[PDB]
From Swiss-Prot:
Organism: Homo sapiens (Human)
Outcome following mutation: E267R: Reduced interaction with KMT2A
Entry comment describing in which tissues the protein is expressed: Ubiquitous.
Result of changing W403R: In MEN1; no effect on histone methylation; almost no effect on JUND-binding; modest repression of JUND transactivation
Protein name as annotated: Menin
Outcome of mutating E253A: In parathyroid tumor
UniProt keyword annotation of Repressor present: yes
Gene that encodes the chain: MEN1
Length: 466
């Protein structure tokens, strides 16, 4: 059901031929999501899943891609009868969106590993009857576009996906599952999650994609991994080129995660003449500030990871403190476990390892060490302050004694003469959380009072009886 003009670039014989196809589609009124996702899934399958026979690039013949496209469009058009769902006002109804979501859901294998790699694309849907969670949401949007439903668009948070549709694109509907063991809410709005101020729904500051941002999503979705130790260089090059295409056309402007993904790719293999990874992480943060009220966690996490890998301890601490400054205005809710896991690993594994190495290097005579810099101690304190403020008013707690052991260790890496230089005002720091306010006294003693720290961080009421 492809148009003549969509077929003229075939066969695709290289990475650059795939980029030309994307450029041509992006120059259209509506880029064809189904065509583009089938092409990426086909090339990913033959570059990462099965490389038998590979000599340069997996040639994508029109006959092959057109037959896959026909399989998809026949499946959707046959199973969704539009006459049963009249379109009032050129916009779609909740019943129609639910029907398309059910069609995709009911097509999937009964049982499979939902966390596998390479199950994101429409190629996986057609050839393997398998999709991952956000892959189902994308497939609903592709199916709606195939049906002529121009109002149905992908909605993305940092850990979940759903659709928007209807009058002014103001309706929301769940179309896929989230996480593992959670009961699905397909067909419902996301209002209760927005109202409860969970990270999962970003207080309503989630992405409402247009079609070009949906192209950017499938490009972010490319998975170059061949196995635990090995990435496809061909898929890395393709993903990086397509991200630059999108960047140049303006379609990453409102997509912080895509800018961090591009910066990560540039760190691995920089493109001559292009912005540095740092510039790109900063544009990701600027995008979040401009379009999403600075309510996103990952723009700062991407920046912190880059500084961590480069052992810029000062700047890694600052960027994690900034992540905590975002999280402090959320309530920690059921289904936010992924961001809890990330903050736990930063506090209880990554920061301790960085400071352990810093301590060894200070023993060896380093100058300008983070451990002698009171501004770095302040960043450490601000990171814990935001985590404590996050916990306030949340329906489930965050901190426990496991966190306290690492806090004491991390504090102890800074000498008392460095800790004393931070000014805690009601380097200068203001605490927002009642936990860190009560800890202020303790933060300056030559020997940290471990037991009193533990009591203040966990709000534990009592010590051992005997
Ligand atoms: C620091 C970080 N390093 N990698 C990070 N990733 C990997 C890239 N990710 C993403 N990159 C582009 N777009 C999206 S939309 C989305 C939510 C989902 F999966 F649709 F439900 C995730 C995500 C998720 C966050 S954060």
């Amino acid at each position: 059901g492809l148009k003549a003009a969509q077929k003229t670039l075939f066969p695709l014989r290289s990475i650059d031929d795939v980029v030309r196809l994307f450029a041509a589609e992006l120059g259209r009124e509506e880029p064809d999501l189904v065509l583009l996702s089938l092409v990426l899934g086909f090339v990913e399958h033959f570059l990462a899943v099965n490389r038998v026979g590979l000599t340069y690039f997996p040639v994508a013949d029109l006959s092959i891609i057109a037959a896959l496209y026909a399989r998809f469009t026949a499946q959707i058009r046959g199973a969704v009868d539009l006459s049963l769902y009249p379109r009032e006002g050129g916009v779609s109804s909740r019943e129609l969106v639910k029907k398309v979501s059910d069609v995709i859901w009911n097509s999937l294998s009964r049982s499979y590993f939902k966390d596998r790699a390479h199950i994101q694309s429409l190629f996986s849907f057609i050839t393997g009857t398998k999709l991952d969670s956000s892959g189902v949401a994308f497939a609903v949007v592709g199916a709606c576009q195939a049906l002529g439903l121009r109002d149905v668009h992908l909605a993305l948070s940092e850990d979940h996906a759903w659709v928007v549709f209807g009058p002014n694109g103001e309706q929301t509907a769940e179309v896929t599952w989230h996480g593992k063991g959670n009961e699905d809410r397909r067909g419902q709005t996301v209002n209760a999650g927005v109202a409860e101020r969970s990270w999962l729904y970003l207080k309503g500051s989630y992405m409402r994609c247009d079609r070009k941002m949906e192209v950017a999503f499938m490009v972010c979705a490319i998975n170059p991994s061949i196995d635990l130790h090995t990435d496809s260089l061909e898929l890395l090059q393709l993903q990086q080129k397509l991200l630059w295409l999108l960047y140049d056309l303006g379609h990453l402007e409102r997509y912080p995660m895509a800018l961090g993904n591009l910066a990560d790719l540039e760190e691995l293999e920089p493109t001559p003449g292009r912005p540095d990874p740092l510039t790109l992480y900063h544009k990701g943060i600027a995008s979040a500030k401009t379009y999403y009220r600075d309510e996103h966690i990952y723009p700062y996490m991407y920046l912190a990871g880059y500084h961590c890998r480069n052992r810029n301890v000062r700047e890694a601490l600052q960027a994690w403190a900034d992540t905590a400054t975002v999280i402090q205005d959320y309530n920690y809710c059921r289904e936010d476990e992924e961001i809890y896991k990330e903050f736990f690993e930063v506090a209880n594994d990554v920061i301790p390892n960085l400071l352990k190495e810093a301590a060894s290097l200070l023993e060896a005579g380093s100058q300008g060490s983070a451990l002698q810099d009171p501004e770095c101690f302040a960043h450490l304190l601000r990171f814990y302050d935001g985590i404590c403020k996050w916990e306030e008013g949340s329906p489930t707690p965050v901190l426990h004694v496991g966190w306290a052991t690492f806090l004491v260790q991390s504090l102890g890496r800074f000498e008392g003469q460095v800790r004393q230089k931070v000014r805690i005002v009601s380097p200068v720091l203001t605490f927002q959380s009642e936990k860190m306010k009560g800890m202020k006294e303790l933060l300056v003693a030559t020997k940290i009072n471990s037991s009193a720290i533990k009591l203040q961080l966990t709000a534990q009421s009592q010590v051992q009886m005997k």
